[PDB]
């Protein structure tokens, strides 16, 4: 009855870490795009 929950941590942390990856891609994208828009003013 130990691995029945020790498997849910790998799946829950799988979806969580994948979400963190997507959040990293989106955050980096908004940073680069906002930097580009900032370059049109300089």
């Amino acid at each position: 009855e130990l691995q029945q929950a020790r498997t849910e941590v790998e799946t829950a942390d799988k979806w969580r870490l994948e979400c963190i990856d997507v959040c990293s891609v989106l955050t980096n994208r908004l940073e680069e795009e906002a930097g580009f828009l900032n370059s049109l003013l300089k």
Binding site: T27, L30, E31, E33, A34, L37, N38, L40, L41
Partner: protein, 62 residues
């Protein structure tokens, strides 16, 4: 000065008048296009400032 062909200089003066009008109107049209370009550029810069403020808000407040 010397003599000239009177009718030829009259016709040439009329041609120069029409060419002057046309060239002047081309200048006015080009200047107007430049004015519209400057205005559109300024407005676009304003909108870009708004979007930079928006992304700044959604980035530094999350």
């Amino acid at each position: 000065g010397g003599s000239h062909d009177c009718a030829k200089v009259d016709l040439e003066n009329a041609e120069l008048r029409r060419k002057l009008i046309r060239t002047k109107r081309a200048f006015e049209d080009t200047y107007e296009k430049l004015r519209m370009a400057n205005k559109a550029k300024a407005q676009v810069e304003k909108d870009i400032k708004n979007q930079i403020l928006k992304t700044h808000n959604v980035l530094r407040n999350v």
